[PDB]
Design a protein around this ligand. Structure first.
Ligand SMILES: [Mg+2]
Ligand SMILES: [Mg+2]
Ligand SMILES: [Mg+2]
Lengths: 335, 4
C-alpha cells in the first residue's frame, strides 16, 4: 500500500517499522523528505497476514529535462533486498504509487556486491549499475559503492575508541587531545553555526560548492539529538574542525565535515574518536566513514579513512533500476 | 561538490 502522509497514525506506524528494522537507514526515514524538501515524497510498504509492516520503500521524486520524474529510494528499500521475490512485490507497490510519473525507480541498498546477486537482479528485469559503470562523472553512481565501515561487533568488549586500534593508531588518536584539542557535541543551533563556519571555510579552500545552512536546519528540525549529533573540535577557544554524524538502524554514519584553514592540530582525528565513542556508548554495530574512490594510497579519502578502518572496504551492489519509460531512460542514463 |  501507499502511505498517506496526512494520516499521523499511519505515518507513525511506518516510522516505527523503519526505526526498529535492522535494515533501517536515515535516508529512508520520512525525516529525509523534510530535509530534501524540494523533492516529492511517495512512500510504500507491504504487510504480512497480521497486517504488520514487513517491508518499506521511501521514494523521493525529482525533476529531469523531460516530462518524467526521477524516483529515487536512497539506500532503500528497508528489508533484505536479497529476498528478490519480496523485493519484486515491494517494487510493484512502488510502481503503482508512481502512477506513470517517473521514468525509473532507482534504489541503492547497502548490501554486498556479488556476481550471483547481480545476475539474479538482472534475471528479474532490473538494470544494475556497479562494476560496469565505475568512474567519476555524470554517469557514476549517486552514492559511492566502496565504503569504509568499521564493524564494532568484532570488538564486543571495547570500552573506548582506543581499544579498537593497534598501538601505532592509538598514538595518532592521542595526539590532538595531548595537544589540547577538546570536542563538544550536541544538536543545537550553536553547534550548527560552528559546523557551518568550518564547512563553508573548507569549501572555499577547495574551491567547491556547499549546501546552504537551511538544509542542515531542516535536518536538525527532523532529527533529535539522539539521532543527529554535531561534534566540534576546538583548542583553547579556537575553532578547528567539526563533523556531523547520524545514528540510525545498526550504524552511526559520519556524513558531513568541515575544517578551518592552516594548523588544525589533527582535530579531525579527535572528531572521529568521539563519533566512534558515541557508537560504542550506544552499543551500535557499525561506524561508517562513508565513501572512497579506490582502495589506494593515492586516494586521499582512503588514506584518512583507513586510519580508522583497517578491514576491506565494503563494496555494495550499486544502483538497481526498475526501468519504467525506456525511451527516457536511454536518453538520460548511459554507462 | 556531492552526497548526503
Ligand atoms: Mg521536466
Ligand atoms: Mg557499548
Ligand atoms: Mg579498524
Amino acid at each position: 500500500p501507499v502511505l498517506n502522509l496526512n494520516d499521523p497514525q499511519a505515518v507513525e506506524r511506518y516510522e516505527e517499522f523503519m526505526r526498529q528494522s535492522p535494515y533501517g537507514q536515515v535516508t529512508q526515514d520520512l525525516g529525509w523528505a523534510k530535509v530534501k524538501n524540494n523533492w516529492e515524497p511517495v512512500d510504500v510498504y507491504l504487510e504480512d497476514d497480521q497486517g504488520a509492516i514487513i517491508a518499506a520503500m521511501s521514494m523521493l521524486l525529482g525533476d529531469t529535462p523531460t516530462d518524467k520524474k526521477f524516483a529515487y529510494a536512497s539506500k532503500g528499500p528497508v528489508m533484505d533486498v536479497t529476498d528478490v521475490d519480496l523485493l519484486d512485490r515491494l517494487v510493484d507497490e512502488a510502481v503503482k504509487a508512481l502512477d506513470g510519473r517517473a521514468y525509473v525507480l532507482r534504489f541503492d541498498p547497502e548490501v554486498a556486491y556479488s556476481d550471483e546477486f547481480n545476475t539474479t537482479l538482472q534475471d528479474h528485469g532490473y538494470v544494475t549499475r556497479n562494476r560496469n559503470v565505475a568512474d567519476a562523472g555524470m554517469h557514476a553512481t549517486i552514492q559511492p559503492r566502496l565504503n569504509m565501515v568499521l564493524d564494532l561487533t568484532k570488538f564486543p568488549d571495547a570500552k573506548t575508541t582506543l581499544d579498537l586500534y593497534p598501538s601505532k593508531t592509538k598514538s595518532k588518536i592521542k595526539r590532538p587531545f595531548r595537544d589540547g584539542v577538546e570536542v563538544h557535541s550536541g544538536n543545537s543551533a550553536t553547534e550548527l553555526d560552528e559546523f557551518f563556519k568550518t564547512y563553508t571555510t573548507m569549501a572555499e579552500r577547495h574551491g567547491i560548492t556547499h549546501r546552504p545552512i537551511e538544509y542542515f536546519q531542516r535536518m536538525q528540525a527532523a532529527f533529535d539529538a539522539d539521532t543527529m549529533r554535531i561534534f566540534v573540535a576546538e583548542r583553547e577557544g579556537k575553532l578547528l574542525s567539526t563533523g556531523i554524524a547520524l545514528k540510525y538502524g545498526r550504524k552511526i554514519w559520519y556524513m558531513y565535515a568541515g575544517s578551518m584553514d592552516g594548523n588544525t592540530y589533527y582535530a579531525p582525528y579527535a572528531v572521529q574518536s568521539e563519533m566512534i565513542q558515541w557508537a560504542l556508548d550506544t552499543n551500535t554495530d557499525l561506524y561508517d566513514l562513508g565513501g572512497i574512490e579506490s582502495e589506494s594510497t593515492d586516494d586521499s579519502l582512503y588514506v584518512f579513512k583507513h586510519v580508522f578502518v583497517k578491514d576491506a572496504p565494503r563494496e555494495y551492489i550499486g544502483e538497481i533500476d526498475k526501468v519504467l519509460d525506456p525511451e527516457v531512460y536511454a536518453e538520460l542514463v548511459k554507462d | 561538490x556531492k552526497x548526503x
